Amino acid sequence: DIKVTPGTSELVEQILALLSRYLSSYIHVLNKFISHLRRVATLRFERTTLIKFVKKLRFYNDSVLSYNASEFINEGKNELDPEADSFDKVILPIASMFVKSVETFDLLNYYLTQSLQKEILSKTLNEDLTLTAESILAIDDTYNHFVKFSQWMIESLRIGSNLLDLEVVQFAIKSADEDNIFLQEILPVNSEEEFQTLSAAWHSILDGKLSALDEEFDVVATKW
Amino acid sequence: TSELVEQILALLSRYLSSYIHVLNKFISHLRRVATLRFERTTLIKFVKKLRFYNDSVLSYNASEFDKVILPIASMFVKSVETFDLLNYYLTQSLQKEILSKTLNEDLTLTAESILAIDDTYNHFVKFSQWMIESLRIGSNLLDLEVVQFASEEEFQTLSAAWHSILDGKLSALDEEFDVVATKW
Known part of the structure; x- marks a missing residue:
């Protein structure tokens, strides 16, 4: 139904640029933490795990920044009947990349903010090596908003x-056996x-979450 | 084409269920090794995600162009990059950590289970790459x-050959999984 236009490739690159900014922010703070962890001999193998996760995030970020949206977008001259690309089909691969990246950040957040924090305390007692409570809060907040954005793209296009x-x-959802961001906070539209309008609003909400994250990341890296 | 997508997705479900099975057993056995408590929790996180993918795939009923191919290729890519992370954690970092904390080999993986994990992974990667490139997506x-x-x-032809190769790998994997599970 909805067809791509000559502004679509721009919109796709702006959406992908947010994901690059989310990926680049972790790359930056975890590069700094991994470098500091060179000095702590008992965290040798946590450090190699984090380096695994960073290599992956850099891989995704390098893929996103290499995507030439234009290559994958066939417009018309003005709705070339059978050949202008459907909009939903242009967004699907982008939503797919968001989903895969969100599920990675779910695994990495849990390792970095739960498991590793306990392990660092258990091995060292050293609160300087831990994240601040405000950074974990900002990590969770950003993640929840990228998850909701991704749900928003996918469900608003019925893809x-x-x-x-x-x-x-x-x-x-399954916790339907009884401020509820993911839930029956539904969406429709058209x-x-x-x-483009709603994604302009989401761009602004995500851009604000990311500046807050960066600020908390700058503060925690103070300790290192 | 419909029963072909069900065949491809079934290989993915078998790969996922096989890890779910052997890690559920590992996680149980780690239940009382206090030095391994937070490692056990990270494994539980990974298993929960593999379970989620598996349930997703099993619930998917092939009944719907780009809007059929791409969610399926997308699922394989996302599953593979996860097993890439989980294999690294499970066969490298965690193995060393286990040796460092316990001082023995009673909870580690066999050298053969690791070879099977890496062999299956490398075949799922080439399979996924083959489909995506051949379908020009x-x-x-x-x-x-x-x-x-x-x-x-x-x-159609290469699918058939890959289905046979992968079926074998999966069977070898699950063999080495039973072997390490008896070791514990």
């Missing part, structure tokens, strides 16, 4: 399926113009 | 990390 579902959203 | 957003460092009958 959703079991294969594009996020763990945390399905978990919140043209590329209307998509 | 490749993009930076579907690339696999590891592939960076390292014709109408066509699809």
Whole structure:
């Protein structure tokens, strides 16, 4: 139904630029932490795990920044009947990349803010090596908003399926055995113009979450 | 084509269920090794995600162009990059940590289970790469990390050969999994 226009490739690159900024922010703070952890001999193997996760995030970020949206977008001259790309089809690969990246950040956040924190305390007692409570809060907040953004893109285009579902959203749903961001906070709507508007609002909400994250990340890296 | 997508997804479900099975057993056995408490919790996080993917795939009923291929390729890519993270944690970092904390080999993986884990992974990577490239749906957003460092009958025919190769690998894997589980 909805067809791509000559502004679509721009919109896709702006959406992907947010993901690059989210990936680049972790790359930056974890590069700094991994470098500091060279001095702590008992965290040798946690350090190699974090380096694994960083290599992956850099891989995703390098892929996002290499994507030439134009290559994958066939416009018309003005709705070339059978050949202008459908909008939902142009967004699907982007939503797919968001979903895969969100599920990585779910695993990495849990390692970095739960498991590792306890392990660092258990091995060293050293609160200087831990994240601040405000950084964990900002990590969780940003993650929840990228998850909701991703749900928003997918459901507003009706491109959703079991294969594009996020763990945390399905978990919140299934917790229907009884400020509820993922939940029956539903969504509906209806043209590329209307998509562009809501994605302009989301861009601004995500850009604010990311500046806050960066600020907390700058503060914690003070300790190192 | 419908029963072909169900065949491809079933291989993915078998790969996922096989890890779910052996890690559920590992996690149980770690239940009372206090020095391994927070490692056990990270494994539980990974298993919960593999369970989630598996349930997703099993619930998916093939009944719906780009809007069929791409969610499926997307699922394989996302599953593979996860097993890439989990294999590294499970066969490298955690193995060393286990040796460092316990001082013995009673909880480690066999050298053979590790070879099987890596062999299956490498075959799922080549399989995923083969499908995506042959179906000409490749993009930076579907690339696999590891592939960076390292014709109408066509699809049907190679699918068949891969289904046979993978079925074997999966069977070898699950063999080595039973072997390490008896070791514990």
